[PDB]
Design a protein around this nucleic acid. Structure first.
Ligand SMILES: Nc1ccn([C@H]2C[C@H](O)[C@@H](COP(=O)(O)OP(=O)(O)OP(=O)(O)O)O2)c(=O)n1
Ligand SMILES: [Ca+2]
Ligand SMILES: [Ca+2]
Length: 430
DNA sequence: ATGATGACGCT
DNA sequence: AGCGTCATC
């Protein structure tokens, strides 16, 4: 009882941008605002494949992966922006540069872990403590939290949704332990007020809206962020967890969306995250290994110790192109040419990274695929990255793959290549 | 025939 | 080192 760790030691937030790429396109072209639209890659094949969808467009059933032409059946008025194309390949710099905008603002509040192009985790333990001293044990006005939901409230003994939001908010705030500094619920609340600030800062300074989750760890924060999208934040407290997890499908938890999660269901015969609490740490370890068993044991009780890593920049930089079906590469003459195009973009990206961030990459990973094989990568080989020269990298990248070419006939390339991937890594200070 | 990323774990 | 998983970058 008194020596049980309840995982209330930190305050963590996850901020993720709403329909990010679409927002970037809509800030640029006002015609796309307040309209079902989507962001698209390579117009030729079926209007291009959709990679981002506005919320107005989601109301018609339009989804990522979907071809635009199919998407226009569900929603004839759908507007598209296209990804910039630069060497017969998609160039994402617009959305990288837009992400930096966001990460720099967030970096002003707390040290962030960049988790993707449009999302970072934040550790607010310090900012909350330091802010608790500044408020003179005064209450927290509801006006400090104009977009916050409290998961599981209102409960106990106004139909429209802002009505409920306020009701849970007041119920929560009315019940608060302002006298106690180390009350975890009070901490989450201060954290939440800071995130209102962060988010109001992001929008003022970029015009981009986001949602956020606030909890005691990265996995709850992540989960919480999804609960009230778009343009809202959610607080998931320790106490809400049993009810939240009691009907939460296991696959909704980060790192259980794939096969490990599939086997937790199949082995244990359960559907929901709360059903894991009926199993011992030893039982869980026997089934899924020591590291998973322990992590699962804790997680279903809302406890997770994975830290918010101080890393605003990427640790690898890379470019891939897929050559599906008919298009697969079957002449060394065109393997060169694509390795050159890739290497060119990479060099563009690398030299920028060297001046911006004061670091140089030192290793060049070269991956490829071959026709028939249905695994992201067939093989993967490293070599030194001594110089930011596209012709040298692409040559080196070629050198590192011929072996694989089964062709006795010299001009050709067998079997054909379904994908080329080049990636800079082993960074070092510069 | 979504395609283009990136982090991390296991051996 | 090189392969595999996870997520969504
Ligand atoms: N498989 C994917 C997933 C995402 N993205 C890009 C486009 C998205 O705009 C952005 C962020 O993706 P999210 O999965 O966070 O989803 P969105 O931000 O598009 O919308 P939301 O997060 O509001 O659901 O990353 C992509 O190119 N390919
Ligand atoms: Ca997003
Ligand atoms: Ca995201």
């Amino acid at each position: 009882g008194p020596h049980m760790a309840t995982g209330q030691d930190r305050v963590v937030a996850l901020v993720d941008m709403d329909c990010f790429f679409v927002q970037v396109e809509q800030r640029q072209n006002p015609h796309l605002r307040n309209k079902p639209c989507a962001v698209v890659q390579y117009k030729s094949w079926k209007g291009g494949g959709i990679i981002a969808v506005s919320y107005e467009a989601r109301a018609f059933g339009v989804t990522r992966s979907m071809w635009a032409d199919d998407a226009k059946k569900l929603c004839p008025d759908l507007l598209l922006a296209q990804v910039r194309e630069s060497r017969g390949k998609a160039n994402l710099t617009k959305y990288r540069e837009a992400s930096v905008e966001v990460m720099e603002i967030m970096s002003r509040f707390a040290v962030i872990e960049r988790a993707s192009i449009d999302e970072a985790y934040v550790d607010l333990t310090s900012a909350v403590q330091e802010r608790l001293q500044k408020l003179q044990g005064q209450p927290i006005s509801a006006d400090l939290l104009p977009s916050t939901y409290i998961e599981g409230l209102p409960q106990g003994p106004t139909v429209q949704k802002e009505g409920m939001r306020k009701q849970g908010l007041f119920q929560w705030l009315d019940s608060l332990q302002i006298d106690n500094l180390t009350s975890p619920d009070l901490q989450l609340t201060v954290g939440a007020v800071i995130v209102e600030e962060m988010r109001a800062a992001i929008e003022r300074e970029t015009g981009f809206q986001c949602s956020a989750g606030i909890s005691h760890n990265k996995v709850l924060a992540k989960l919480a962020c999804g609960l009230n999208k778009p343009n809202r934040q959610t607080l998931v407290s320790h106490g809400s967890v049993p009810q939240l997890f009691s009907q939460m499908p296991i696959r909704k938890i980060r790192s259980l969306g794939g096969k490990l999660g599939a086997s937790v269901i199949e082995i244990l015969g359960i559907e929901y995250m709360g059903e894991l609490t009926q199993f011992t740490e030893s039982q869980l370890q026997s089934h899924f290994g020591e590291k998973n068993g322990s992590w699962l044991y804790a997680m279903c009780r809302g406890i997770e110790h994975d830290p918010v890593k101080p890393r605003q920049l990427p640790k690898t930089i890379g470019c891939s192109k897929n050559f599906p079906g008919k298009t697969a590469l079957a002449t060394r003459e065109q393997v060169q040419w694509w390795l050159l195009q890739l290497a060119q973009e990479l060099e563009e990206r690398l030299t920028k990274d060297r001046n911006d961030n004061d670091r140089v990459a030192t290793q060049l990973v070269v991956s490829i695929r071959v026709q028939g094989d249905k695994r992201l990568s067939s093989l993967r080989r490293c070599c030194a990255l001594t110089r930011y020269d596209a012709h040298k990298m692409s040559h080196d990248a070629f050198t590192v793959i011929k072996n694989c070419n089964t062709s006795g006939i010299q001009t050709e390339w067998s079997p054909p290549l379904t994908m080329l991937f080049l990636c800079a890594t082993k960074f070092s200070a510069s």
